[PDB]
Amino acid sequence: EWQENKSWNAHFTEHKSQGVVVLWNENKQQGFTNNLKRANQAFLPASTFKIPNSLIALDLGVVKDEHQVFKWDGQTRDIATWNRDHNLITAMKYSVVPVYQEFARQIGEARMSKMLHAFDYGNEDISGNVDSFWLDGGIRISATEQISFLRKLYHNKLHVSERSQRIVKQAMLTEANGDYIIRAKTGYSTRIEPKIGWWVGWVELDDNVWFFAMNMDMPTSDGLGLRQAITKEVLKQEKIIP
Ligand SMILES: O=C(O)c1cccc(-c2ccc3ccccc3c2)c1
Ligand SMILES: [Cl-]
């Protein structure tokens, strides 16, 4: 059951942008969004794919645990934080594509495809290069589809071990204070139009969980901070966070 609240569009327009925020109240099993059409439009997941990618790599033993070090390959890239050693935690924190590209190559197309179908993840289509299909291949996912996937992750209901799901939820940790915990993952899609940014995850409260998934137009990297800012303004508006 779903309600459309066009008043949230103000948060996008104030910043001369366009996008969708989708909220899900777990206690009440009710969803909310500013744009039901865009809520169900499928986009490239980009670095939000690092969630399913981590789960599969851990569950197959490609990644031993969250401490295993993935050594920088020595190739200088334009993102400074990528030119260093990483573990699962920091690789997630800094969206370190090269690390996850090597995961995908070791996972393999066959096992990746099988796992994404078991996850019911998006259109489950890995068409393209195994090490970049989530950036410029055929895989697509909508904001509402992100929520269904995330809800299964939260409840340890995905078809991987509980350990794998706990580790990935730890690596998703983004913000925590006395009022809430946010576990989430950002995304930035540029190789295929329209260029968008993602932010998907959930807000843990004492007595409830609010799942969220947003995407917005991102013609330039200058607006990437709006992914979190716009999401948080909606959360504040709905009195989910002070
Ligand atoms: O936020 C992310 O989720 C993310 C995921 C993957 C890559 C990048 C990325 C890539 C190129 C950039 C260029 C200019 C400024 C920032 C840039 C950031 C960000
Ligand atoms: Cl944690």
Swiss-Prot record:
The active site is at residue 47. It catalyses: a beta-lactam + H2O = a substituted beta-amino acid. A beta-lactam binds at residues 47, 50, 95, 227. Its EC number is 3.5.2.6. Inhibited by avibactam, related diazabicyclooctane (DBO) derivatives and by bicyclic boronic acids, via a covalent binding to Ser-47. Inhibited by chloride, bromide and iodide ions. Not inhibited by the beta-lactamase-blocking agents, clavulanic acid or tazobactam. Gene3D superfamilies: DD-peptidase/beta-lactamase superfamily (3.40.710.10). Induction: Expressed from an upstream promoter, P(out), in an insertion sequence IS1999. Carboxylated on the epsilon-amino group of a lysine, with the resulting carbamate functional group serving as a general base. Probably N-carboxylated at Lys-50 at neutral pH in vivo and undergoes complete N-decarboxylation, at pH 4.1, in vitro. GO terms for cellular component: plasma membrane. SUPFAM superfamilies: beta-lactamase/transpeptidase-like (SSF56601). InterPro entries: Bact_Transpept/Beta-Lactamase (IPR050515), Beta-lactam/transpept-like (IPR012338), Beta-lactam_class-D_AS (IPR002137), PCN-bd_Tpept (IPR001460). GO terms for biological process: antibiotic catabolic process; cell wall organization; response to antibiotic. It comes from the Bacteria. Pfam families: Transpeptidase. The modification N6-carboxylysine is found at residue 50. PROSITE patterns: BETA_LACTAMASE_D. Class D beta-lactamase which confers resistance to the beta-lactam antibiotics, including amoxicillin, and moderate resistance to cephalosporins and carbapenems such as cephalothin and imipenem; in the DH10B strain of E.coli. Acts via hydrolysis of the beta-lactam ring. Has oxacillin-, cephalothin- and imipenem-hydrolyzing activities. Belongs to the class-D beta-lactamase family. Monomer. Dimer. When OXA-48 is present in clinical isolates of K.pneumoniae, increasing chloride concentration during antibiotic treatment reduces bacterial growth. This is Beta-lactamase OXA-48. It comes from Klebsiella pneumoniae.
